[PDB]
Amino acid sequence: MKTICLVGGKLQGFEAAYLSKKAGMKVVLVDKNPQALIRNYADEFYCFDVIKEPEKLLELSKRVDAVLPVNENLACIEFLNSIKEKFSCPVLFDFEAYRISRDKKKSKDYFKSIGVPTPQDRPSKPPYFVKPPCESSSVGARIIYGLEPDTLVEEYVEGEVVSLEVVGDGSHFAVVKETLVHIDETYDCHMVTPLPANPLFRQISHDLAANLPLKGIMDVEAIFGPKGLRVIEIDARFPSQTPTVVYYSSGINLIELLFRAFTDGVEEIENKYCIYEHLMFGENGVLIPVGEQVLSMGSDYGKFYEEPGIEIFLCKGEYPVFTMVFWGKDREETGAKRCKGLSVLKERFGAVL
Ligand SMILES: Nc1ncnc2c1ncn2[C@@H]1O[C@H](COP(=O)(O)OP(=O)(O)OP(=O)(O)O)[C@@H](O)[C@H]1O
Ligand SMILES: Nc1ncnc2c1ncn2[C@@H]1O[C@H](COP(=O)(O)OP(=O)(O)O)[C@@H](O)[C@H]1O
Ligand SMILES: NCCC[C@@H](N)C(=O)OP(=O)(O)O
Ligand SMILES: [Mg+2]
Ligand SMILES: [Mg+2]
Known part of the structure; x- marks a missing residue:
């Protein structure tokens, strides 16, 4: 069994979580919103802002098979770009x-x-x-x-x-x-x-x-x-x-x-x-x-x-x-x-x- 880490828990996040479950994958959600839309749908939920606490995400990358950005927050996307070489798993993004x-x-x-x-x-x-x-x-x-x-x-x-x-x-x-x-x-x-x-x-x-x-x-x-x-x-x-x-x-x-x-x-x-x-x-x-x-x-x-x-x-x-x-x-x-x-x-x- 593989585990996917989703950064973002709204509609993109739901879609990714849904198909990950169909694939028999465990879904770990990261989202800065304590009330993130799909928080209860994910298998695990960690509430933090990845820009404020990147070390937490980098630590998570050691225990999952991939990290998938599923948000359109440009600040988040550009920040992940700046630290992507530090991940211990692939970042599924171009x-x-x-x-x-x-x-x-x-x-x-x-x-x-x-x-x-x-x-x-x-x-x-x-x-x-x-x-x-x-x-x-x-x-x-x-x-x-x-x-x-x-x-x-x-x-x-x-x-x-x-x-x-x-x-x-x-x-x-x-x-x-x-x-x-x-x-x-x-x-x-x-x-x-x-x-x-x-x-x-x-x-x-x-x-x-x-x-x-x-x-x-x-x-x-x-x-x-x-x-x-x-x-x-x-x-x-x-x-x-x-x-x-x-x-x-x-x-x-x-x-x-x-x-x-x-x-x-x-x-x-x-x-x-x-x-x-x-x-x-x-x-x-x-x-x-x-x-x-x-x-x-x-x-x-x-x-x-x-x-x-x-x-x-x-x-x-x-x-x-x-x-x-x-x-x-x-x-x-x-x-x-x-x-x-x-x-x-x-x-x-x-x-x-
Ligand atoms: N730096 C970040 N760290 C953690 N989660 C984030 C970050 N940036 C965005 N997200 C989460 O990703 C999800 C989708 O964000 P996005 O900005 O694409 O949609 P939005 O509807 O504009 O978000 P918001 O609900 O903040 O207005 C949101 O739940 C948001 O909280
Ligand atoms: N030039 C156009 N003529 C007619 N309808 C359009 C045009 N551009 C966009 N739309 C309509 O608006 C919707 C949203 O535009 P789109 O460019 O696909 O942006 P988005 O980033 O918002 O999803 C499209 O799905 C389509 O229904
Ligand atoms: N593949 C079409 C999916 C359409 C829509 N749900 C989306 O996520 O993208 P936008 O055109 O930016 O709203
Ligand atoms: Mg569009
Ligand atoms: Mg469109």
Whole structure:
């Protein structure tokens, strides 16, 4: 049995912990927040700030098999970079790739440098899509029909938002499984489903990783627009939501693949269906779809229910949020599991949907 140390206990942390458990790994969480979201989900919890007490993390590195940064605190990421040679286990991260990926303008420059289509900057005709240069979870992302002079202003590209994860070992780049990102009125993601292979998107994703070169994990987000595929962002860190759908639909565990990239290396290149979604239990049991932004305001997050083809996680807080995971051999069976999972909420908690 191996042990993984996660630095950060919110949504990235949950995803990493979930897949680590599927891999039969013990999960050690480090987080500066005594109320860290997944503190009770991890097998062990150590509450400290790694910047203030690096010696504690370095000591932990002696008794775990890998350390995985799962936060987007730049101060933390840059500090870990400065001490990474001191760890007694691999640090599963690509710091240079993250530096490019975190800055959306820098990323777009990179896309252009290798001939990858991306939305036109500063269009003359509405609607415009605007977003901060360095946020995630769709924070500050809005459609416009005096922003910071550093705000990204783009043409609005209509169509499917599609995600691909790539794990690189520096030499080989394993492009995994296409997923559909279902957006809400805030452009946050409330649902994820798998998609058939897209050879063009796979090649683009491969080339984005290969030209770095990627040693770590990165996802690629593209919109399948009316005039073709346009890559909107890359994020060189462990993502939330999509890796669960990747796991059920393809059989590939992204935590195991990432761990392999830093130990044995990786090789390039199941077909089930999966529905992943968040639902808030509102006033009087009204079920409301919500995005990640809502889930990250929670106070406690862990497993609520399981049966064959159904996993339900409960995020406690101001109005409970359920994360529902359904899988089966095809859309029909998975839809049947979704109904059963919903009816559990209906009969148990008097939920309405
Ligand atoms: N230096 C650090 N040491 C320990 N844990 C950290 C550190 N920096 C961030 N974290 C933890 O990682 C988790 C995710 O952090 P991140 O900054 O990516 O999301 P956030 O929602 O902006 O965090 P916060 O809850 O602080 O606003 C948080 O629970 C945070 O407490
Ligand atoms: N140019 C664009 N046109 C239309 N929608 C966009 C555009 N850029 C981003 N979006 C939408 O906003 C969401 C968040 O933007 P993204 O660039 O993927 O940032 P993040 O770092 O926040 O996840 C996307 O998933 C997509 O739904
Ligand atoms: N692989 C798509 C996962 C999307 C999302 N949950 C995420 O973690 O990244 P952002 O686009 O920065 O919000
Ligand atoms: Mg992003
Ligand atoms: Mg994004």
